[PDB]
Amino acid sequence: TSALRIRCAHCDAVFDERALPYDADVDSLASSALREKFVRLSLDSESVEFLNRARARGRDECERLARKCTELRRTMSLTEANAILGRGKMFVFSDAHVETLMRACGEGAGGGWFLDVGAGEGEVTRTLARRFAGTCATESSPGMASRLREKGFDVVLESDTVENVVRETRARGGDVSEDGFDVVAALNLCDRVRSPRALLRDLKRALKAKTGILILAIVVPFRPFVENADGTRSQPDERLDVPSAGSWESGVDALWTELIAPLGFDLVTLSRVPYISEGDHLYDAYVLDDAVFVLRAPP
């Protein structure tokens, strides 16, 4: 009539979909702008549908892909091996999450140019790119860059920098405005890049003045570490005053100041969504705590 109550000491931690945190303590933020500009998102059938992808795939099938992935990544990275096998997909935003934040930033209706930094597979930003008449993407992987040119992206820049992204897009047929893109998404990239300040500065000069929407996602807690190449682990140079542990509210207020706020952005809305990763034969999904900052470019 109910689940089994088995007392163990080595079964790890397991939660359901209702335990996923979507809200936070609003009054526990020293920054005033972070309190009123908070929009609480929630679960939906699209996010739950992503959770059951490992269950509907089969345990024996999730084991075949896992063994083949470790065998493939001897000569490539982890993300490149998952794209070849069609596993390890990432989920952050649902279609309902899109219509909520797009109406909040003013540019709710479709149209304009969109830039996805670090897309690779673009499945995370797939529902978002349906609104813009022009879509661009930047990915340093050659194999994954060719995949983006087949899914609907008009221009796919095969590089890991965004110094002259607004100018290099126009060189490849990207009929984007000379003053920058309209909306740019940098989802879960500050924990991997070396210079997070120089990244936001490059993201700033890539947007239009005044009317310039920026979508930034950072995993909380913020543990920055840069991977050089194969078997070469490094450390970030910019020591941001952000705790490596603690609660979600402390990391947001620490990432707001010191890093995001000194850039001079206008906070449109702040939300808390789970960073869902596709499961396998052991767990249905792996989830991290993610924070979403929607910013407007200064004049």
Residue numbers in the entry: 7 to 305
Q: Can you list sentences taken from the study reporting this PDB entry?
A:
The human (Homo sapiens; Hs) methyltransferase (MTase) METTL9 is the first enzyme shown to generate 1-methylhistidine (π-methylhistidine) in proteins. Putative METTL9 orthologues are found in most eukaryotes, and we have here investigated the activity of such enzymes from several species, representing all five eukaryotic supergroups.
Like HsMETTL9, the OtMETTL9 structure is a monomer, adopting the canonical 7BS MTase fold consisting of seven β-strands (β1-β7) that form a twisted sheet of characteristic topology, alternating with six α helices (α1-α6) located on both sides of the β-sheet. Like HsMETTL9, OtMETTL9 contains additional structural elements (β′1-β′3, α′1-α′4) outside of the core 7BS fold, which are typically involved in substrate recognition. We also noticed that the binding surface of OtMETTL9 could instead extend into an adjacent side pocket, where peptide residues located C-terminally of the HxH-motif could bind, creating a bent, C-shaped, binding groove, as opposed to the straight groove of HsMETTL9. Binding of the peptide in the C-shaped groove in OtMETTL9 may impose additional constraints on the identity of the Xc residue, which may explain the more stringent requirement (small residues G or S) for peptide methylation activity of the OtMETTL9 enzyme as compared to HsMETTL9. Most of the residues that are in contact with the X or XN positions in the HsMETTL9 structures are identical and have a similar orientation in the OtMETTL9 structure, such as N88 (Hs N118), R93 (Hs R123), G94 (Hs G124), M96 (Hs M126), R198 (Hs R214), D286 (Hs D300), and Y292 (Hs Y306), whereas S283 has similar properties to the human C297.
